[PDB]
Amino acid sequence: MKINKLNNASKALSYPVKKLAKTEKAPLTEKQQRSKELKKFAMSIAREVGGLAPYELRATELLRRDEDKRCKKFMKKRLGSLKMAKKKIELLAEEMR
Amino acid sequence: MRHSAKSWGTGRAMARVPRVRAGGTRRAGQGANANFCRGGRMFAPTNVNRRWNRK
Amino acid sequence: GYLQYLKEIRRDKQSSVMRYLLRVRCWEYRQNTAIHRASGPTYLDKARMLGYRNIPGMCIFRARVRRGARPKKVLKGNTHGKPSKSGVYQRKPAKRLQAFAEIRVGRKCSNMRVFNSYWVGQDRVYKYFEVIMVDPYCDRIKNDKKINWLCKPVMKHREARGLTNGTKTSRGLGKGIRYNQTKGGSKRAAWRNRNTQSLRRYR
Amino acid sequence: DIQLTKKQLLSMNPRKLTNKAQMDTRKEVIATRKEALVNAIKLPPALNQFTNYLSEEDLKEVSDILSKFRPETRKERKQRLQNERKGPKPIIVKQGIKHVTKLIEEKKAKFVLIACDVDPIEVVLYLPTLCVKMGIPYALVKTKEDLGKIIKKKPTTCLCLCDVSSDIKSKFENVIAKCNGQFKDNYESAMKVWGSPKE
RNA sequence: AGGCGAGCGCCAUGAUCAUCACGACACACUUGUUUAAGGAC
RNA sequence: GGUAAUGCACAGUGAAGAGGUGGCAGUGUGCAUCUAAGACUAAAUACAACAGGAGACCGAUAGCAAAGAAGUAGGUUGACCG
RNA sequence: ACCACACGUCCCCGAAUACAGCAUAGUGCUGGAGUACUCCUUGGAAUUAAGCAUAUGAGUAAAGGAAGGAAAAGAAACUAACGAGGAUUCCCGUAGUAGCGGCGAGUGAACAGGGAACAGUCCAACAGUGUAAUUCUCAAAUGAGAAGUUGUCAAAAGGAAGAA
């Protein structure tokens, strides 16, 4: 059997290359900026025209009573992900302020 | 192995070979599928999977 | 532009305006016959993502499907076999409910090709869909440069062979280790490649 | 053959009309029963807006201004192109939802008309809120056909104007003041009242 | 924000969200009472 | 094969514009790699009827059921059988 | 005379239709046959476990739908942790392995490494506003009308080779 002869320490070694730095892409052109602005604008109009959904109302009500941990549990069960819940709570909080 | 055949079973004073289901022809009641039968299947039919070449 | 505003509103399915419109439309769809022709698309943005234009030789049809799982077709629950295969209820179909809509529209509109389909509503009993159809024997279409491909003879009955957006999803196709069951083209193509004995000349 | 009365049509069950011969009647049963349902239930504030529109008198006043900026016909267009370029840039009234929304967004548009009887409505639903945010005046008209007649062609969803000839300026300003009264000035109050069932 | 027994639990009533019967209308749904009858059952 | 879910469905519930994955459940945090929910695509691969060429194959109880007017003579109420 | 190549003629029943469903400005299209090979559904039991109920045979048989000379697939919400590679399909191989399993009987893949053949592109998001510039019909040598603003319209002839 030609397997499992080296230790983990010696398997971790590596050859000394010379690396190339990554080309950063930070510049964003004028036309790309206007494009992003118009999309964010459109998102405002929808919220203005049609308002909040039932679970969003129930959520925001709990935030007024400082029921932070109840709101957390509630949102987790509605959206599934604990990450989506943490994000949606932060967006709702900012809307109320 | 083409034909419709079945054994008559014991009690008829005949050997229990499969026989051809038919009527109106002399072929009725003849002995069908086995290697010891006229028009039956050969023992261990020759087959393409045999090893033809040699190393 | 205009199509962006429509997208954002179509996504808010529990806004007051969308609850209003879903209620009134689902009432009307159920008063009509089970497959009927529409005047135009209900949602302009969605139809245009999927390839609709308002030119001669394209149409929208609308279809309804009954909801829930599909029971085993046996009398009195008698299955004549082993107990692990005796269940009748709680058996779920392999294809989406959408796939049934596409298959039935294609039978009725036999002179035309099924392009794509989308959701338009639900209630307690039915689910409702719009199907985009094209006519390959039409001079306008034969000379188009974007949908002229649908006239190729291989494009007959895409829906029956699991090739449309609604019918494709039950096949299990994809890229990576999570889809090893379909390496080769399909489940049956993988089966053949795995259950074959290879007998070389020199061996 | 015979025209059925309103009472009859409201009585019939559409699902029991089944023969090929009966399809036109099935259509009429559905049409009348839908009307009764929509009058019975409350409208959200945004949909309720399109219940308020100009009088036939105001429509006349507006049309009698706008008609002087009619678009070119194909006959006119051909002639123009055989001749050379001459004179100043024309003023023309503009049409179609795609162009209008662009001109609102670019803050080019100066006054806008919108039609009410549009199906599906989601095409025009957002226009008043966008007009209020950009600060452009507007007015609502009953039918798509009312608009078609202004520009002497097929019905449309909306019309727009981006410029004013000095000749017209006095009348123009008065019209805008009338419109602001019925429409733009009232907006913030309107977005909070639900449409009552109709008596 | 009131009252009782050597701030405690117990007894008063005043604001905040669901919510179970009962009424009275008509719009879903039901029925050849059909230019009609029921009715959120 | 997919093991505290590999893929596909049905009912409830239901996102974000930024998200998905790194074969063992969870929470946090850097790092690497990609961009779903719209479409098209040649060549290299598979195999009947019908035609052509070959063979250490069979030689009229064999070889296809059938080397002649063979799916024929003939038979089943019938499906079918020969 | 006779033969070989093509054409003309081609009774009645049969999808069998003076019909059904459906599209266009209009002309029209579908239906039945075939289905070895390819794609999509539905779905057994004999048998093995020396009994048998989970499991096996097997996602196989049977029954339905559909297409072509092939069909399906296909240009990474992909692998990998190397000093990394780079669409799909096929062959050699990893491998009767990692694992699944009354952990019994039995089942069972992937990347690498060596090759055959090689090719990349479209729609939406996003079309001239000093004028729908776009498609169709009839006339005419320059007019009438239909579709369309709930959005139309984003360019080349051309050739000698190769094979039967």
UniProtKB/TrEMBL annotation, chain A:
Indicate yes or no for the key word ATP-binding.
no
Among Pfam families, the record links this protein to: Ribosomal_L36e (PF01158)
Q: Where does Mg(2+) 1 bind?
A: N4
Enumerate the Gene Ontology biological process terms: translation
What GO annotations for molecular function exist for this entry? Answer: structural constituent of ribosome
- Keyword Ribosomal protein appears in the UniProt entry: yes
InterPro entries in the cross-refs: Ribosomal_eL36, Ribosomal_eL36_sf
Superkingdom in the source lineage: Eukaryota
Q: Name one GO cellular component term.
A: ribosome
Q: Which UniProt keywords apply?
A: Metal-binding, Ribonucleoprotein, Ribosomal protein
Name by which UniProt lists this protein: 60S ribosomal protein L36
UniProtKB/TrEMBL annotation, chain B:
Please give the superkingdom of this protein's source.
Eukaryota
Q: Which family does it belong to?
A: Belongs to the universal ribosomal protein uL4 family.
Q: What is this protein called?
A: Large ribosomal subunit protein uL4
Which species is this record about? Spraguea lophii (strain 42_110) (Microsporidian parasite)
Boundaries of the shown chain within the full protein: 56 to 110 of 328
Automatic annotation (TrEMBL), chain C:
Instruction: Give one GO biological process term.
Output: cytoplasmic translation
Q: Which GO terms describe its cellular component?
A: cytosolic large ribosomal subunit
UniProt entry keywords in alphabetical sequence:
Ribonucleoprotein, Ribosomal protein
Where is there biased composition of kind Polar residues?
Answer: 193-203
Q: Where is this region: Disordered?
A: 161-203
Q: Which GO terms describe its molecular function?
A: RNA binding; structural constituent of ribosome
Cited SUPFAM superfamilies: Ribosomal proteins S24e, L23 and L15e (SSF54189)
Q: Which InterPro entries match?
A: Rbsml_eL15_core_dom_sf (IPR024794), Ribosomal_eL15 (IPR000439), Ribosomal_uL23/eL15/eS24_sf (IPR012678)
Under Gene3D superfamilies, the record lists: Ribosomal protein l15e
Q: The organism sits in which domain of life?
A: Eukaryota
- What protein family does this chain belong to? Belongs to the eukaryotic ribosomal protein eL15 family.
Q: What protein name applies here?
A: Ribosomal protein L15
Q: Which organism is it from?
A: Spraguea lophii (strain 42_110)
**What is this organism's lineage?**
Eukaryota, Fungi, Fungi incertae sedis, Microsporidia, Spragueidae
Automatic annotation (TrEMBL), chain D:
As one GO molecular function, the record gives: RNA binding
Which residue numbers delimit the Ribosomal protein eL8/eL30/eS12/Gadd45 domain?
92-167
| Record key words, sorted | Ribonucleoprotein, Ribosomal protein
- For the keyword Ribonucleoprotein, the answer is yes
One Gene Ontology term, aspect cellular component: preribosome
Q: Into which family does the record put it?
A: Belongs to the eukaryotic ribosomal protein eL8 family.
**Cross-referenced Pfam families, in alphabetical order?**
Ribosomal_L7Ae (PF01248)
User: Per the UniProt entry, what species is this protein from, by scientific name?
Assistant: Spraguea lophii (strain 42_110) (Microsporidian parasite)
Taxonomically, the superkingdom here is Eukaryota
Role this protein plays:
Component of the ribosome.
Kindly provide the name given to this protein in its UniProt entry: 60S ribosomal protein L8
